[PDB]
């Protein structure tokens, strides 16, 4: 019973595709004070 309760936390949270990547953008700019260049649909 504990198995699928670790599962259905994972398989029911994500609404954004690479949800970890936006969490990387949060967990850098909080450590580093609003880093520029976070939001880019482009590749430089």
């Amino acid at each position: 019973s504990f198995g699928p309760m670790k599962r259905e936390v994972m398989e029911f949270d994500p609404e954004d595709p690479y949800k970890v990547s936006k969490m990387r953008k949060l967990e850098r700019s909080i450590a580093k004070g609003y880093v520029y260049g976070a939001d880019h649909q482009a590749i430089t």
């Binding site: 970890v20 969490m23 990387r24 967990e27 850098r28």
Partner: protein, 48 residues
């Protein structure tokens, strides 16, 4: 201006207005700084 003139026939240079605008100069610097994805992986994958 420090004004002075004199003389009997010595020509008297008139008073002087001096305004000088002197600009500043920019020099934007940059040091690069590297953090690896393997460094950022351990905070953000939460192993056992």
């Amino acid at each position: 201006v420090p004004r002075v003139a004199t003389g009997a026939g010595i020509p008297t240079s008139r008073q002087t207005t001096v305004m000088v605008s002197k600009y500043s100069e920019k020099s934007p610097i940059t040091i690069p700084f590297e953090i690896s994805a393997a460094c950022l992986t351990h905070l953000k994958e939460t192993f056992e």
